[PDB]
Ligand binder design. Sequence first.
Ligand SMILES: O=C(O)CCCOc1ccc(NC(=O)NC(=O)c2ccc(Cl)cc2Cl)c(Cl)c1
Ligand SMILES: O=C(O)CCCOc1ccc(NC(=O)NC(=O)c2ccc(Cl)cc2Cl)c(Cl)c1
Ligand SMILES: *Cc1c(COP(=O)(O)O)cnc(C)c1O
Ligand SMILES: *Cc1c(COP(=O)(O)O)cnc(C)c1O
Lengths: 816, 816
Amino acid sequence: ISVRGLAGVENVTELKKNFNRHLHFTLVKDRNVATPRDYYFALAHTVRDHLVGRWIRTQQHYYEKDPKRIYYLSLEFYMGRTLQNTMVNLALENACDEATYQLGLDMEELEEIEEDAGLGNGGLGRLAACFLDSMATLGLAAYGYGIRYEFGIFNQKICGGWQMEEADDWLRYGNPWEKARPEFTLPVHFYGRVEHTSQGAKWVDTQVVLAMPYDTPVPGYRNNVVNTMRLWSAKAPNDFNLKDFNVGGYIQAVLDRNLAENISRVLYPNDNFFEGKELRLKQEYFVVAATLQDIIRRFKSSTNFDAFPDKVAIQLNDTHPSLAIPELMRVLVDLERLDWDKAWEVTVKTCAYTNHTVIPEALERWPVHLLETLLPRHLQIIYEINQRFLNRVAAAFPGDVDRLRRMSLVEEGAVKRINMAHLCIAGSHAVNGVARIHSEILKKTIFKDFYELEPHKFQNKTNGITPRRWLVLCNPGLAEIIAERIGEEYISDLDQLRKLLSYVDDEAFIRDVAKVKQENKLKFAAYLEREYKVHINPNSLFDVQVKRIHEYKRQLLNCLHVITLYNRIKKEPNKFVVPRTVMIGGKAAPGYHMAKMIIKLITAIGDVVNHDPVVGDRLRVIFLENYRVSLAEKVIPAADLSEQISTAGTEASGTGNMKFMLNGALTIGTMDGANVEMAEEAGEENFFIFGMRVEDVDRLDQRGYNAQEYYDRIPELRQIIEQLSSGFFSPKQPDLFKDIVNMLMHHDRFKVFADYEEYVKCQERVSALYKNPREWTRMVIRNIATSGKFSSDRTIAQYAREIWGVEPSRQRLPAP
Amino acid sequence: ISVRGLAGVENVTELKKNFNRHLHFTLVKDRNVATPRDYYFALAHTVRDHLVGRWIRTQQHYYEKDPKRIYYLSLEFYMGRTLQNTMVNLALENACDEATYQLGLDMEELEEIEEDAGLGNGGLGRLAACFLDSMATLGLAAYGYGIRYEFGIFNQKICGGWQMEEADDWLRYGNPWEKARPEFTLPVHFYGRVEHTSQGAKWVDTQVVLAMPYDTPVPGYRNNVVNTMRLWSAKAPNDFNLKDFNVGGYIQAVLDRNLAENISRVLYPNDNFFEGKELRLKQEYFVVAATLQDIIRRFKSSTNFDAFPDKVAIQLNDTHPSLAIPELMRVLVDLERLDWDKAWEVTVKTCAYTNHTVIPEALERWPVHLLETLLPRHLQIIYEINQRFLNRVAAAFPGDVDRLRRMSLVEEGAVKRINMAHLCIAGSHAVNGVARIHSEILKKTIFKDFYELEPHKFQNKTNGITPRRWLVLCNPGLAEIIAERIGEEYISDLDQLRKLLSYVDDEAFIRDVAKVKQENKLKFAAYLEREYKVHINPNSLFDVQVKRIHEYKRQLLNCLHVITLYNRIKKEPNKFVVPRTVMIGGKAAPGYHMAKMIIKLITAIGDVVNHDPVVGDRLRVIFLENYRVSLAEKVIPAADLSEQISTAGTEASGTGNMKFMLNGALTIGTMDGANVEMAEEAGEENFFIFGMRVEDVDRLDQRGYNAQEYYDRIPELRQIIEQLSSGFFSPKQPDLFKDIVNMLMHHDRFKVFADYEEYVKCQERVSALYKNPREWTRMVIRNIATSGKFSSDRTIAQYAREIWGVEPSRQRLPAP
Ligand SMILES: O=C(O)CCCOc1ccc(NC(=O)NC(=O)c2ccc(Cl)cc2Cl)c(Cl)c1
Ligand SMILES: O=C(O)CCCOc1ccc(NC(=O)NC(=O)c2ccc(Cl)cc2Cl)c(Cl)c1
Ligand SMILES: *Cc1c(COP(=O)(O)O)cnc(C)c1O
Ligand SMILES: *Cc1c(COP(=O)(O)O)cnc(C)c1O
């Protein structure tokens, strides 16, 4: 078997008896009534047993040495399953595989029983999960802090072509990885009012909600380091949530506890979109307030807070945890009694902010009346921060009255709002973009005024993904042939993949790389019929676009191409075309009408295309249901063409793109986000770039975008639009897609038509190359061998050195 | 050390390493940061490990042999802590004590960390818990079925003398004893409507709630038998509780899941009182519907249901689970398609009902409109049952039109109601009282008409308590000296206690019995200052009355005596009186105003009495806060006088009385409930009986009860009432007790004044005897030696033989 570790004689024996110990004592079952779900739990408990020893010494280590601690605050941690990832990082995969084999079980079958920890929406949440893995692998004293939702991202179901949402009860059967820590339970306050006394302000008459922490282990890759991810759960106090007497009902008082506990009930399913609901604000303060108390309690052990920034670094994953700034101030000033200026100095030096998008609708602007009611003291502090900040601006740019209002954290208008992004820039010593182009756009556009005031704050930290879960775990076959030639060191040193460049003309390697891709496609094609049922051709080109459904991602542009292909086939049926299986997957936010309309369009196209006899097996349109981390681990290693076609300037970075490049897929996309650095790394000749560049989009906006022009000059495009309009794809409901057509023609913010021509032309070129297996595979090798830069180990090493002030280390912790 | 088992060399070593295994692997802690709570969990997990082996073979045994199964349906299971009880039944107490000692820990300190499983209100719920223990000890294939409330009986707090209720979050830190069984999850239906088709009725358009079971082990006493208690938890389905589309909000849909899950959220805190709330009815159907499906699924394995009653016995603990009758019919007729008559025959033969009270306000009478909306089909079946039953009556008593309406399960009037007690008698083959006198009252009064129709159905099964938890566990010192003389066989054969009669004149025994009682009082007196703080005299007579607060229990009669004692002391300060520490404890239902007023009176008396310098240490009035099972295990073994003074005819049986008799307390009470059989067993000369007999109460009712008469003829009583009225006990609020005085004088349903004179006279006689240690102790021996009849092993053996048709067995199951 592969390099999934050694299957030692003693360890396979030890594993088996421990599996049986748990099946008996833990699951209280006996082989005759054990269900596959019991088997999955016996294994999980057995594997978890192997890292507790290391978990304890790692934490005890940090207590003894007392290094600077890194706190990663995110309202999302898209973790996925954790059994295999733990086996991989512990080098237990083969031993476990062997052991379960002897016990007569199929490890892979059991792995499929684990529920995904879908505590994230997309890119932002998965980034935090990859980062955690990298921080552990680089031996950093890091902690992931978030909310333990009992319901993560909803499960997607397609009914009559429409998306149906359903609760993600991932904790239903229990979570063997987490451990409640009811000793570090903390109180969080809401509402109340502010009393201004003789020696300071006081936040009074507040409603209390308790925060109970749950720790999950985050094992580093083969270095015996196990960091912690602490997730907070909301709990109602038993007193006041019953003790506030004078009629109401005792039963009612108890049932009403599920009101304070609703704070950690469900994840908001919005990807790159802001919804100003009170429940959302509560979740944001809740995770911030509890985390900070925990952070300071740890520090108090390790009272001059002058050394606080020397021992603490808190990274804000977007503006979601932004209340950490005014909350840090509140504690320091109100509770610790530090003077404002000393407190501000400390706050700015320990906080750092990461921006993830530039679209306006994603920007957090909280109505003042909301902050005023829920967090009265914080609003006061935000006004004071704003006051002193604007004084700094006025002093720097005397008389620039317009700049003053542009930079204010307080936005005037219909209803006053607080610009959380402005708050984060003001109270952080570093602000970074997630890709070179996005970072430049921040300085040139969105935060131009802030950049002029303090240029030193702005940086860039191009995103990355973890090679462990995104290669070794999902694509062992590829990881193996690579290791056969250049060794195993690249798993924690992705740059070494460059060494593969010297095998680009190797006849054996070319054949191998092409063989694993073929085996991956056959397995996926099988999985497709197994769990979803309705055949596909594994010899065709696997054209996949998987990410959340968004207008800016242009799944719609992909649709126009699919329809074009179909129409050309119908025109010349007996002409040869490279067969393609185009797969589109992703979830739409429940309230996103347009996004839900696009899912219906995709399934509608498939209904026509997949049943047209003249088309045969040359073209299949499939919608990938319930796209999530565990599903991504299946499609990506099987894809041939990765679609990254967002309008230039809208996708801050993207990470799915990197996942595909690492797994042997060629990329067709626009010069957007990280796409630019990928093409720059692989060489533009090895990339399928097309469409407008940021500049072209701007030029078009200056003159004005008119979709009619394109509709008029391109017959193929016009034909498609008239097909949608006439009900060619929706016979029973001829006007079903009027909203899409209307939008495309009159309010297309992402100029889908503008990139149409260059897009189908470029698609022709990839079909041409696919017709030449050898050359396609050689280009694939050029991509893989040049993907090393996109490892999150590189990203983390940069955050560590350029923002946190800590030195990464690949040193093995002193055994378990 | 005592006979808490052997501390084997190998087993103490084995215990220690397993304690450390769990502390490390399970609690992920290390000795340096382990909290006492961690230590308690390491032990619990270690002790639980010892019975899983037996749990599995016991259940596998019942599958192989396939004996008749006993299902005990109760909405309450007042279990208390379970660590020690498990050690006792497994003979692990000494080994564990030794092992923890060597590990440097105090087992008793750790035991106090366990939370009480307070899933009951009082007598009814504790009975079910004692029964479970006895059914296991007698080797019966029995299952306890109930609801797993996340909030049990509220925790009582006394503020300014008033009772304050607070949520009992007993699952906060987890329950090491239970195990979720997500494989036997079942759906339960609510609402909907009935469709009458060609081949039967159909319950349609129902709302579905899932029932998830949790199993807790019930170990028998040293016989290697471990039965199961299955508790249901309400869970919302992820579909419809989200899938019923067309606007409303996705977040809201998810948050609204806590609506279907509110069914198992909290226990109703009503003791002997009926509240017709919909949530209560839902809990009742929920436990019934899920349990029956589970029962039939088991049977289908073991379709002629003719043999159903031969393999299944379901006991109804009161009328709470009464819907099991119409639900059994529904399944048999609607689903299995059995003819009515065959279905009814089967139902009557498998169901048996237990009555627990005769007070009208405790009777379950559900409004028809409620059953009509929530369970439409059941209402139809109940009407049909009623129809055929009344036809039986009319045929038996031709022309007795009044009897017809008296016996109907349907009560006419303001709003129609269903008399659940009538339903239970009609559909059960046996109906029993809980004490000889209560059982006679059922036949002569309440169910007279039913008794005349089917005399064969009515039986008696005097309650009992388990000698394991109620002697060996709470009073090891007494259990030891008893064992020193007559052996250990009596623990599972309480009748052998009679052998103690021959030591009644033994000088050594008399001295020993008196020594353990003294050690128990010193320990309790210490515990009092430890956890509640405010001293008491251990040389005084411990006068305790602990039970739920009720007007019928007459805590008020106890109060009048306490005030009398105080007044006599004030009159003649320098006269000698036997010192007394009277302790009153118990919870009042939150909506029970009178009951809450009585708690305030008790604390008010103590305020006056405990601080009067002339009184000194001759009299202390203490209110025992948060009375519960674990607290009962502390007070009972320390009591000298047990107060069982309910008005004759109101306390069906009582069980606290038996607990006291077994632990060396003498009893002062009325000829009520089980008191009669206790005095009959010990000899009236060894009992302090007083007051009216049932007959006297009736005579008084015929002529009419006038409290004024007693107030007029007894100066001491009049003085007390004028003290309450004038604010002698409530200075700042002089009229604070007007409701009590008003009630006592004008609407005393329990004639407190009628028993006053005989009560204080009888109290004088116990004080006289207490002055003679030797004789008091000899009378105590007469009580203990004669308490054997009151073991639940006797009660269960009778239910088994006279109702269930199974033979008890004290055979050890083939090792673990
Ligand atoms: O056909 C055959 O295999 C031959 C007959 C074998 O029959 C068997 C074998 C095994 C079992 N049962 C358990 O292991 N385990 C449990 O029942 C069990 C499961 C969970 C919990 Cl919390 C507590 C228990 Cl006690 C039972 Cl009930 C019957
Ligand atoms: O003064 C002394 O004793 C000498 C210094 C000893 O310092 C120590 C000793 C032990 C520990 N820690 C654990 O055992 N255990 C944990 O931290 C721990 C607890 C629960 C969970 Cl879910 C996961 C972990 Cl990793 C730590 Cl953090 C520090
Ligand atoms: C990597 C990943 C994403 C992010 O994909 P992009 O194409 O950058 O939007 C979203 N969801 C899941 C399941 C992922 O694995
Ligand atoms: C035994 C017991 C009861 C029942 O006591 P009675 O005096 O029969 O009402 C109530 N509560 C608890 C805690 C018990 O242990």
